[PDB]
Structures are given as structure tokens and as C-alpha cells.
Design an enzyme around this catalytic site. Structure first.
Site, PDB file in Angstrom:
ATOM      1  N   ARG A  25      39.964  10.911 -15.285  1.00 35.90           N
ATOM      2  CA  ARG A  25      39.958  12.345 -14.956  1.00 35.90           C
ATOM      3  C   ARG A  25      38.696  13.103 -15.395  1.00 35.90           C
ATOM      4  O   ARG A  25      38.517  14.261 -15.019  1.00 35.90           O
ATOM      5  CB  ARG A  25      41.205  13.059 -15.505  1.00 35.90           C
ATOM      6  CG  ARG A  25      41.099  13.342 -16.990  1.00 35.90           C
ATOM      7  CD  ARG A  25      42.325  14.046 -17.571  1.00 35.90           C
ATOM      8  NE  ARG A  25      42.202  14.048 -19.028  1.00 35.90           N
ATOM      9  CZ  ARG A  25      41.425  14.892 -19.723  1.00 35.90           C
ATOM     10  NH1 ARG A  25      40.701  15.835 -19.096  1.00 35.90           N
ATOM     11  NH2 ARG A  25      41.386  14.806 -21.056  1.00 35.90           N
ATOM     12  N   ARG A 129      70.549   2.028 -23.057  1.00 36.09           N
ATOM     13  CA  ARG A 129      69.834   3.325 -23.120  1.00 36.09           C
ATOM     14  C   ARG A 129      69.105   3.623 -24.438  1.00 36.09           C
ATOM     15  O   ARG A 129      68.917   4.781 -24.784  1.00 36.09           O
ATOM     16  CB  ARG A 129      70.801   4.504 -22.824  1.00 36.09           C
ATOM     17  CG  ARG A 129      71.591   4.236 -21.595  1.00 36.09           C
ATOM     18  CD  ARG A 129      72.800   5.085 -21.531  1.00 36.09           C
ATOM     19  NE  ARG A 129      73.686   4.744 -22.628  1.00 36.09           N
ATOM     20  CZ  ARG A 129      74.976   5.024 -22.617  1.00 36.09           C
ATOM     21  NH1 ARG A 129      75.482   5.540 -21.527  1.00 36.09           N
ATOM     22  NH2 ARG A 129      75.758   4.679 -23.634  1.00 36.09           N
ATOM     23  N   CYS A 148      56.428  11.647 -18.524  1.00 36.25           N
ATOM     24  CA  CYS A 148      56.126  10.996 -19.798  1.00 36.25           C
ATOM     25  C   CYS A 148      54.843  10.191 -19.658  1.00 36.25           C
ATOM     26  O   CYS A 148      54.453   9.736 -18.585  1.00 36.25           O
ATOM     27  CB  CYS A 148      57.348  10.124 -20.329  1.00 36.25           C
ATOM     28  SG  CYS A 148      57.385   8.379 -19.869  1.00 36.25           S
ATOM     29  N   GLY A 170      46.555   2.173 -19.777  1.00 36.41           N
ATOM     30  CA  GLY A 170      46.190   1.510 -21.018  1.00 36.41           C
ATOM     31  C   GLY A 170      44.702   1.291 -21.014  1.00 36.41           C
ATOM     32  O   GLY A 170      44.172   0.682 -20.075  1.00 36.41           O
ATOM     33  N   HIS A 209      43.048  -0.591 -17.727  1.00 37.17           N
ATOM     34  CA  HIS A 209      41.651  -0.407 -17.348  1.00 37.17           C
ATOM     35  C   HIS A 209      40.685  -0.651 -18.493  1.00 37.17           C
ATOM     36  O   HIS A 209      40.995  -0.470 -19.698  1.00 37.17           O
ATOM     37  CB  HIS A 209      41.434   1.014 -16.821  1.00 37.17           C
ATOM     38  CG  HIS A 209      41.881   2.074 -17.779  1.00 37.17           C
ATOM     39  ND1 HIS A 209      43.165   2.583 -17.765  1.00 37.17           N
ATOM     40  CD2 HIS A 209      41.217   2.755 -18.754  1.00 37.17           C
ATOM     41  CE1 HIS A 209      43.282   3.503 -18.718  1.00 37.17           C
ATOM     42  NE2 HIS A 209      42.120   3.627 -19.334  1.00 37.17           N
TER      43      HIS A 209
END
Lengths: 263, 263
Positions: A25, A129, A148, A170, A209
Site C-alpha cells: 500500500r 470455536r 481482521c 505475511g 511476500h
């Protein structure tokens, strides 16, 4: 059996070989592969990577700081690792609470995700869960109900506690080795508190990456042979996740290749 | 290249071989392995499993029903596949909305997770937050902020759309083959709408399990050789995810072994 670190090294090598250029980004370039997974045994060994020296003391200190639920940077800078807003600790211990100060008193405000994971393992070890989630704090004001950044799912069978960490992306050079150790450490703590043996740590990624400036150092790290993982000893019987302190842990037999500085 | 269905069959075989007995929440027994992953190419083939016949028409019809945001059972029973409360469709299209009736009008109530995924792929294909989540509806009243049952993370690079589905547990005999097809189909739709080519479907599980009564049929399914996957043709240029209808899709060249009834 083959050395667990070979998965991390195979993943690096697969990304170098087959990864595709993609910008993050800030428009900084990476080589990227989508969807990866590795499983590291925690049974009588601790997956602190040995092809470079991992800053264990920062892993431990940062995890204790997350667990204490702290949003004060100087609480981590004073123990020696260098107001952050609602960072991971606040979300683990006070999930869904309307964040105010780093000084504010949060007793019984929001869901304690971490105690709920431990209580569920004690009341129903089969539960499907047993899950905690964390957010990248910068996403919080961006839209309603942002996704998340990472989730931990726990699993118990035959007295063993396993954990699967799913991270939507990651950083293989810098973030991954460090997180393998952090979440393997979180599993060891939770196992110890609930009376279980550590099982496996499964690490799953969306965008796995490598930053372009890390390619050269990782190419060199790839020629190094792992040494047998160390062990982690817990030195004191501890009752509550809040009671662990740095001195309760000892890494034993850690024999890494030299430090590689990435970045 | 090896046939994509070999991963599913290797996973079954790994669970039979190495899976551990574990009960589900009705005390019904399974063989269980924690943490698995498989990747199925979507490039010029469609991963509708061939070692048994998969009910494609139910996959398609159920997905269209989810996408329309419906909580009416008879809207799916009338198209031929056999008030459900806030099921997956309601959560995909009206996420976080306070659920009332199946007749109620929900225009602009809650986050449209599915349109947001499509809008994000159009406005920023690199985004690492292209994620939708779904809940098991029975968990909703059980505690505050219950964990998601499944999440889909999307990823785009070089004009190709990939999807990773993470499910906290996977019924390998009955649910998995069906979900491989459903989410591969969802990827094809979203690719078509955003002008991209389908990439990979990555399927990741927490508790990957086989019900005891399915062991025998799966042991037989394991001796069957996959036939080349079929192709999925989309027959009409479609603009909006809401406009797809069953007749826009044609499975071509599907040549499966016989139906296996599980359960």
C-alpha cells in the site's frame, strides 16, 4: 524426521522462484504468492529459527506486553525492545470496547478473548470455536466492520494443544520468523496454564511476500543449514496467563547462524 | 501437471492414516487432523470433483440463493434442492444488521460484504483486506462477539482473481467437495463481474475431519482415478452479481465416477 525450518526455507525459495511482482500500500514492491501453510512441531522443541539469529528477548517481551493488554509504548521501550491506540493487546483483552486513553481503567470492559480461549479449553476441549482475532488498528476508522488482520484458532486432542495462525499477509523476510516464535510461545503459555502439552503450530498465509530489498539477504540465508531447534523451558508452575513474567522462560540449546539485518 | 483432485484424495488418505479420534458437539465420532490446505487451479478447468458425482445443480442453486440474500427455505426448495434465521446470505449482503423476518425489507441495512469485495477489487486490486466472513447462525445468541465459521480472502495479480477459503472445520466426506465447488463458483462469478480471469482456489481448514460412518465409502472412493476436471462456461456477459441466474452457467465435459451416498 526432516527439520521444521526447511518449510520456511522452502517457502522463501518458492516465492523467489514463482512469486509475482506486486506493490504493497505504500507502492513498495514485493514478490508475492497467495495461500501458503507450514506446520511446526512444538513437541520437545521450540521453532525459533536458526538460519539467522531471531531476537528472542523482543519476542518474549512483546508477547508479555500484548498479554498485559497495554497500549503504552514506553512499557515495552523500558524493558528494552524499541500511546499506540488500540493495538493487539487491547484487542486481545478488551475486544469491542470503545478505546479511550492508555491510562484508562478497562476492568471488565469488552470481551477478554484470551481468557475466553483458555476457559473454553478447560470447559470444552473439543470446541471448534476456540478462536481469537486481531485487527490492524489503522483499519478501525476506515470503514464499518473492517476485516481482521489475523486469527488464532486453537485445537486440543490427546492432551495436546495446537494453534493455527491465519494472517491475511505475511512479510516473509522480517515478520514471519518473529511471528512463528511469538505464536509458538503463546501456545506454550496457554498449554502450560490449561495442563496440556504443546502440539503443532500451523502458520497459514494469504499474501505471503518478500520485499525486493530482502531478496539478496534471503538468497544467502537460503544456503545455511538449520541446526536442531532449541527447547523452551518454563521454570515455575504458573496459574494465570497474567502471572507469567520474562524470567519464567529459558531458551535452551539455541545455536543460530549470524544475524541478518533486513531492510 | 498432476490432477488437482489428488490433493483432496491425499488429504482423505492422510486423515485415515494419521487422524485421531475426536467427538463433534453431538458426541458423534470423527477422525481428525488440525491444519490442512489444498490449492486448485481455476485456469481453464473447474474443480468439480470426479471421484464421485457432485450435485452441481444444488451447488449453483444454493450459491444464487446466498447471493440474493435470502433467509427463506422455500426459495431454495422450489428450484429443487431441499424461515432459517440469519443464514449465510443475510450475512453476506446485510452484515451486522439486526435480523427480524424473512419477509422484511433490508435495502441498505448492514454492510454488503459481497459488493464491498467486488468494489474493492475495482478500486484497489492490491488491497490486502478483500475479505468476507460468515457465521454459524447457532453461535449468534451463544456469547458476545462469537468467532466466524469461515472467511474468504480474495487476491488479484496479473489480471487473475484468487480466493482462499478458511473454514474452522471441514467435514471431508460430505461438506468439502461441495464447498470446493461453491467457492470456486463464487470466484468465477466475481472474476467475471470485475473483468478478471479466475486464478486459484486455496482451501484451508482448521479441524479437517472424517465422520466414522464415512470411512468405508471414502476408502472405496480412494481407489478411483480422477478424470480431467470439467470446464465452466458463463454464457452471457453479466454486469452485477445480483443478475446471474442458473441458466447463465454451463458445466462442460463433466465425467464423474458414480454417486457415493455419505451418511
Amino acid at each position: 524426521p526432516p527439520h521444521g525450518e526447511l518449510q520456511y526455507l522452502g517457502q522463501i525459495q518458492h516465492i523467489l522462484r514463482c512469486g509475482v511482482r506486486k506493490d504493497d500500500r505504500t507502492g513498495t514492491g514485493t514478490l508475492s504468492v497467495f495461500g501458503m501453510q507450514a506446520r511446526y512441531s512444538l513437541r520437545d522443541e521450540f521453532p525459533l529459527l536458526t538460519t539467522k539469529r531471531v531476537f528472542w528477548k523482543g519476542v518474549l517481551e512483546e508477547l508479555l506486553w500484548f498479554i498485559k493488554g497495554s497500549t503504552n509504548a514506553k512499557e515495552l521501550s523500558s524493558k528494552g525492545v524499541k500511546d499506540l491506540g488500540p493495538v493487539y493487546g487491547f484487542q486481545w483483552r478488551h475486544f469491542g470496547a470503545e478505546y479511550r486513553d492508555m491510562e484508562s481503567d478497562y476492568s471488565g470492559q469488552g470481551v477478554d478473548q484470551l481468557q475466553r480461549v483458555i476457559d473454553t479449553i478447560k470447559t470444552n476441549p473439543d470446541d471448534r470455536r476456540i478462536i481469537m482475532c486481531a485487527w490492524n488498528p489503522r483499519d478501525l476508522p476506515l470503514m464499518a466492520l473492517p476485516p481482521c488482520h489475523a486469527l488464532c484458532q486453537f485445537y486440543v486432542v490427546n492432551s495436546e494443544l495446537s494453534c493455527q495462525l491465519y494472517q491475511r499477509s505475511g512479510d516473509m523476510g522480517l515478520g514471519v520468523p518473529f511471528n512463528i516464535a511469538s505464536y509458538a510461545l503463546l501456545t506454550y503459555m496457554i498449554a502450560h496454564i490449561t495442563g496440556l502439552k504443546p502440539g503443532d503450530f500451523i502458520h497459514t498465509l494469504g499474501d505471503a511476500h518478500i520485499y525486493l530489498n530482502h531478496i539478496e539477504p534471503l538468497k544467502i540465508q537460503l544456503q545455511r543449514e538449520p541446526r536442531p531447534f532449541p527447547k523452551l523451558r518454563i521454570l515455575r508452575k504458573v496459574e494465570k496467563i497474567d502471572d507469567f513474567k520474562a524470567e519464567d522462560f529459558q531458551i535452551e540449546g539455541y545455536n543460530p547462524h549470524p544475524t541478518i539485518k533486513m531492510e
